[PDB]
Amino acid sequence: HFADLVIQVIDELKQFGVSVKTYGAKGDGVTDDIRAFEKAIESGFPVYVPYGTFMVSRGIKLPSNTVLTGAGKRNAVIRFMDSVGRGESLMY
Amino acid sequence: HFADLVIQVIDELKQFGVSVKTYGAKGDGVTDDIRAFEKAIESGFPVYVPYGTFMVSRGIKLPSNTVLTGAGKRNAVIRFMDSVGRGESLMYNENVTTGNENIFLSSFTLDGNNKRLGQGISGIGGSRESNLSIRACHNVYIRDIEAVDCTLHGIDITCGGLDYPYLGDGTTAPNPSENIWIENCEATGFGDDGITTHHSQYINILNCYSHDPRLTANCNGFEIDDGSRHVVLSNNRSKGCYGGIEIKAHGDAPAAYNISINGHMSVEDVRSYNFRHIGHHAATAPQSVSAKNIVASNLVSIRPNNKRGFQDNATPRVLAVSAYYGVVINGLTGYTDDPNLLTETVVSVQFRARNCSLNGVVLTGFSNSENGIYVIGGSRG
Amino acid sequence: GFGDDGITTHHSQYINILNCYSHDPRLTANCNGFEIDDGSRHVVLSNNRSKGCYGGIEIKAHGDAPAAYNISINGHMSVEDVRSYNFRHIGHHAATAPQSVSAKNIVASNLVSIRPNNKRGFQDNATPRVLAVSAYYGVVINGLTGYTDDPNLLTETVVSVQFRARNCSLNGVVLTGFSNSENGIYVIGGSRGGDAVNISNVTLNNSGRYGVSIGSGIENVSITNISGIGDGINSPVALVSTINSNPEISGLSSIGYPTVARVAGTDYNDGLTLFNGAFRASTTSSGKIH
Ligand SMILES: [Ca+2]
Ligand SMILES: [Ca+2]
Ligand SMILES: [Mg+2]
Ligand SMILES: [Mg+2]
């Protein structure tokens, strides 16, 4: 309960803007983080992606005027889950 | 005791991955932070380097699949301590013999601290004592790195082993580096060459800047040396060096072949573009079996001179081609405001060189040289 | 590890693709490192690399598509691809087929093709090329280097201009190591061949049994400054070869080729200087010249 206050101080500092973990992203290579992304992008803020394997169950949609910068190649990873259907691009 | 909890919350957030300060790095310009680095890299996490002068007592080894990104040039600085011995490169890959894979180095200064050794000293032998040394490695991406005060090279790409191999001409050395990318990097105050390749293939050197070497020998801004092949150099700059770009080899080495230059600026160098194969220039000497294929465009040579007296005061050149077969030059501009710097020959093709195309050349200001363009004849012309 | 193409454009304009790296596709169809496809225009590609693909860079279109036009390449490295640089317009190659109204304008510099091969068997084992130009009008190439250490990978033709292609300039070309291919540079003639092409400042280091080859029925080709070496070639024939007599030729030299020039079934063993059409030299003024 203590760490959550420290986190929510940083999440309002917005060093890179709004982090995607602020909206409930794990990036643990298992958890479906799709809803965290959609929320972060529609907020109107530059979305940042820190370290982790951010799994996804459906394609990430990108509206107008979006800034999406991560921590690097093989650092901030975005992946489709082993049970995603057909017809969608990972990012579009 | 309170701050330590706040820190250890952030250290688990991993905004850039694991910070190097998490493992006990100070970056205060005094503390030896070597153990903090080694721990961070072996953790399997992308290591981040924040602000500070991160001192070191021995060379940083880099295993396979490492991401090492800092806070920028002249921001995240890595330095050798005033009491480090001889025989190590500031940063280099762990497996010296068989190399490593998938290394990514971004946004930091590397101060080799050659200053500590005294005036006019270079590497003790082989690829040893560079600010960065990539040996026998596959898929290496080097970005936004500044290499200052270097013992040997700023950045060196080579094959397996600490010594450079000399298997004669027409040979291809074992364990070569492969798929290398070097972008936005800077090399200065080096002992031998700013940025250099050996016995390695598939390399893009882009938008870099090598300048102002410490010494007076074969001190080239960019040197594509022994055994090198399939290299593109694009939009780099060199200044105050002997050769702006040198594509050569030694006698007992195979010459660099299939090298491309997509634009270059050469400022106040001695021989702005110098291609040759040492030991294959004389008439009685055996013919090079390796010195082939150079394509160069948009070459700029500015104020070529030898005021610093490189290579026993070798005469200045905008371009010199020797031994090589198949050299294509499209669009070359040589400019000088001082006619006394170059007096012999502005451009020359020589020493057994064949199949050369000079197309679209502007040479101006060389109003005191004997020859603009000179194809030398004679016994080995 | 892609299914179709590494990096690709369609029906879009104003694009800079810079310092990228597309390689090693999963499949075996039209798997190109970079593919500037249907409807594309005004694209610059600079200092990219491709490896282990079919086409290193492909600028094409499909039959029912307009061809990519006004495309620039400011340097490229193509490693172990099948057809390092492959330009065409499918459905506009055959003689009876309608002429492309879209396949125009390609400018390319500092092109590097390394070890072109088809070991993986792309496109029904299509024959390897350093460069292949088809259908397109107005192709400029300045500074091209093809290199191989293995002569068996490419055996047919190192460079070819074909399938209704027009207005092509090959300038500053070094092809080496292709000592087992039939042709270094080949402008194919015949019913749907290439025409209106300039080949200048070309050095062939053991590359092609026929160094430069011009097919039948071709009206307008210019060949200047070609020099070849053919010692290490398996049974070399001619440094330059031309089946008809109306290409123009100057500045030919070679060592190791039994014939420097074969033109209209005639050996010119130490080279030729040939101009066609009205001629005038060292005169102040003139009227009509047939
Ligand atoms: Ca040197
Ligand atoms: Ca395709
Ligand atoms: Mg060297
Ligand atoms: Mg397509």
Side-chain angles (χ1 to χ4, degrees), chain A residues 2-92, chain B residues 2-381, chain C:
Chain A
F2 162 68
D4 298 29
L5 280 179
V6 182
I7 288 164
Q8 280 178 321
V9 167
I10 301 158
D11 291 356
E12 283 191 303
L13 277 175
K14 288 157 185 170
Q15 293 164 299
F16 328 88
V18 301
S19 179
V20 77
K21 291 197 168 183
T22 305
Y23 291 84
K26 265 277 180 285
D28 52 11
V30 192
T31 314
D32 191 31
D33 304 342
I34 177 66
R35 289 296 300 112
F37 279 95
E38 300 184 23
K39 281 188 283 179
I41 312 160
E42 75 207 4
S43 76
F45 290 102
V47 188
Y48 179 80
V49 189
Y51 169 75
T53 312
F54 298 73
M55 304 301 286
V56 135
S57 61
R58 68 190 177 276
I60 302 167
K61 292 187 179 185
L62 298 166
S64 298
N65 306 263
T66 167
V67 176
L68 180 59
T69 153
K73 293 177 167 184
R74 302 194 191 204
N75 190 325
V77 178
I78 303 163
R79 200 169 190 271
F80 264 145
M81 285 177 64
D82 298 10
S83 58
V84 180
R86 302 293 293 254
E88 264 195 315
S89 287
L90 216 191
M91 191 168 285
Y92 65 93
Chain B
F2 162 68
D4 298 29
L5 280 179
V6 182
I7 288 164
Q8 280 178 321
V9 167
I10 301 158
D11 291 356
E12 283 191 303
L13 277 175
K14 288 157 185 170
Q15 293 164 299
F16 328 88
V18 301
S19 179
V20 77
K21 291 197 168 183
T22 305
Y23 291 84
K26 265 277 180 285
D28 52 11
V30 192
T31 314
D32 191 31
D33 304 342
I34 177 66
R35 289 296 300 112
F37 279 95
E38 300 184 23
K39 281 188 283 179
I41 312 160
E42 75 207 4
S43 76
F45 290 102
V47 188
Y48 179 80
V49 189
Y51 169 75
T53 312
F54 298 73
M55 304 301 286
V56 135
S57 61
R58 68 190 177 276
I60 302 167
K61 292 187 179 185
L62 298 166
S64 298
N65 306 263
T66 167
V67 176
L68 180 59
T69 153
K73 293 177 167 184
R74 302 194 191 204
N75 190 325
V77 178
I78 303 163
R79 200 169 190 271
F80 264 145
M81 285 177 64
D82 298 10
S83 58
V84 180
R86 302 293 293 254
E88 264 195 315
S89 287
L90 216 191
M91 191 168 285
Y92 65 93
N93 78 121
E94 193 174 333
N95 203 322
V96 171
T97 315
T98 319
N100 292 280
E101 296 192 320
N102 303 297
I103 303 160
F104 296 77
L105 310 172
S106 313
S107 306
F108 54 85
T109 299
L110 293 163
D111 189 323
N113 194 199
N114 187 79
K115 209 164 172 67
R116 81 188 190 270
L117 305 167
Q119 289 304 79
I121 309 173
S122 185
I124 42 90
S127 53
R128 299 175 186 96
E129 302 201 293
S130 296
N131 289 18
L132 184 52
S133 291
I134 298 306
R135 307 180 182 92
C137 281
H138 289 226
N139 327 303
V140 179
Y141 306 72
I142 303 161
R143 283 200 45 81
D144 195 24
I145 304 301
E146 185 194 36
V148 194
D149 197 33
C150 323
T151 304
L152 221 213
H153 308 302
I155 305 159
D156 178 28
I157 316 298
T158 186
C159 61
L162 289 156
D163 287 324
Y164 299 124
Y166 295 92
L167 315 166
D169 192 14
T171 42
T172 159
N175 308 313
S177 280
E178 193 154 311
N179 185 28
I180 317 299
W181 294 76
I182 306 160
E183 298 158 64
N184 298 16
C185 296
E186 191 164 343
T188 187
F190 44 89
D192 200 3
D193 304 304
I195 301 159
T196 177
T197 61
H198 303 88
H199 315 272
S200 301
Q201 52 191 202
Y202 319 136
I203 299 148
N204 272 238
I205 301 162
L206 320 171
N207 328 303
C208 295
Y209 180 37
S210 178
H211 59 106
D212 302 312
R214 281 186 297 104
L215 306 189
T216 292
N218 207 39
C219 293
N220 303 311
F222 298 81
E223 182 180 309
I224 319 301
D225 202 15
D226 322 312
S228 304
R229 63 270 172 182
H230 322 302
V231 187
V232 166
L233 296 87
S234 181
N235 298 308
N236 312 269
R237 197 192 293 167
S238 56
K239 198 192 178 210
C241 315
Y242 169 56
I245 299 176
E246 179 171 76
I247 309 167
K248 75 152 204 302
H250 304 298
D252 292 317
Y257 61 92
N258 203 37
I259 314 297
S260 163
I261 305 160
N262 190 21
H264 180 85
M265 202 195 288
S266 169
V267 189
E268 282 165 25
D269 302 309
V270 186
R271 298 205 161 192
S272 292
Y273 308 95
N274 178 211
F275 323 133
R276 56 213 186 95
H277 191 168
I278 300 161
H280 299 83
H281 296 146
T284 58
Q287 191 167 333
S288 182
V289 287
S290 56
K292 295 109 135 70
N293 300 50
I294 295 166
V295 181
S297 315
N298 275 292
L299 299 190
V300 188
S301 174
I302 309 149
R303 290 170 46 94
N305 73 105
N306 206 359
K307 286 173 167 176
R308 280 191 62 191
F310 289 90
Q311 299 267 120
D312 266 305
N313 268 266
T315 63
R317 290 286 185 281
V318 160
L319 170 63
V321 190
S322 308
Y324 271 92
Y325 272 51
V327 181
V328 171
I329 312 294
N330 291 115
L332 160 65
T333 174
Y335 189 101
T336 184
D337 49 14
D338 193 359
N340 300 310
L341 315 179
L342 202 155
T343 305
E344 200 178 52
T345 301
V346 189
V347 173
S348 71
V349 186
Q350 58 193 246
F351 298 158
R352 282 154 147 277
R354 293 291 180 278
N355 310 288
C356 310
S357 277
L358 300 156
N359 186 236
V361 177
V362 194
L363 306 176
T364 98
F366 301 86
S367 48
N368 221 314
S369 40
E370 201 66 8
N371 319 289
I373 304 160
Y374 181 28
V375 183
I376 315 173
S379 221
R380 71 260 180 78
Chain C
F2 44 89
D4 200 3
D5 304 304
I7 301 159
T8 177
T9 61
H10 303 88
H11 315 272
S12 301
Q13 52 191 202
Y14 319 136
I15 299 148
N16 272 238
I17 301 162
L18 320 171
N19 328 303
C20 295
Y21 180 37
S22 178
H23 59 106
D24 302 312
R26 281 186 297 104
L27 306 189
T28 292
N30 207 39
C31 293
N32 303 311
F34 298 81
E35 182 180 309
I36 319 301
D37 202 15
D38 322 312
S40 304
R41 63 270 172 182
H42 322 302
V43 187
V44 166
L45 296 87
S46 181
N47 298 308
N48 312 269
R49 197 192 293 167
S50 56
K51 198 192 178 210
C53 315
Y54 169 56
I57 299 176
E58 179 171 76
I59 309 167
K60 75 152 204 302
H62 304 298
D64 292 317
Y69 61 92
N70 203 37
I71 314 297
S72 163
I73 305 160
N74 190 21
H76 180 85
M77 202 195 288
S78 169
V79 189
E80 282 165 25
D81 302 309
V82 186
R83 298 205 161 192
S84 292
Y85 308 95
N86 178 211
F87 323 133
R88 56 213 186 95
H89 191 168
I90 300 161
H92 299 83
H93 296 146
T96 58
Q99 191 167 333
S100 182
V101 287
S102 56
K104 295 109 135 70
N105 300 50
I106 295 166
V107 181
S109 315
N110 275 292
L111 299 190
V112 188
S113 174
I114 309 149
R115 290 170 46 94
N117 73 105
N118 206 359
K119 286 173 167 176
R120 280 191 62 191
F122 289 90
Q123 299 267 120
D124 266 305
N125 268 266
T127 63
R129 290 286 185 281
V130 160
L131 170 63
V133 190
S134 308
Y136 271 92
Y137 272 51
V139 181
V140 171
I141 312 294
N142 291 115
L144 160 65
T145 174
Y147 189 101
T148 184
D149 49 14
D150 193 359
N152 300 310
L153 315 179
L154 202 155
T155 305
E156 200 178 52
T157 301
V158 189
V159 173
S160 71
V161 186
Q162 58 193 246
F163 298 158
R164 282 154 147 277
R166 293 291 180 278
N167 310 288
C168 310
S169 277
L170 300 156
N171 186 236
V173 177
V174 194
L175 306 176
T176 98
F178 301 86
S179 48
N180 221 314
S181 40
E182 201 66 8
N183 319 289
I185 304 160
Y186 181 28
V187 183
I188 315 173
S191 221
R192 71 260 180 78
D195 213 327
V197 17
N198 312 310
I199 297 100
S200 73
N201 308 316
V202 176
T203 137
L204 310 170
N205 199 148
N206 296 302
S207 295
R209 277 182 279 276
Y210 298 82
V212 177
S213 210
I214 316 294
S216 59
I218 280 150
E219 328 285 335
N220 305 308
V221 167
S222 282
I223 297 157
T224 80
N225 309 333
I226 319 297
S227 79
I229 309 140
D231 317 306
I233 302 179
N234 169 216
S235 286
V237 192
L239 185 262
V240 169
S241 190
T242 295
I243 98 92
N244 100 284
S245 190
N246 55 36
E248 295 176 311
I249 298 155
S250 72
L252 299 198
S253 73
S254 69
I255 176 81
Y257 278 91
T259 319
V260 174
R262 185 182 281 110
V263 168
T266 310
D267 295 346
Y268 303 90
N269 269 290
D270 298 307
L272 226 200
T273 303
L274 148 38
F275 296 96
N276 281 311
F279 191 79
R280 168 167 152 200
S282 63
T283 107
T284 48
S285 58
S286 64
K288 296 210 264 274
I289 309 165
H290 190 272

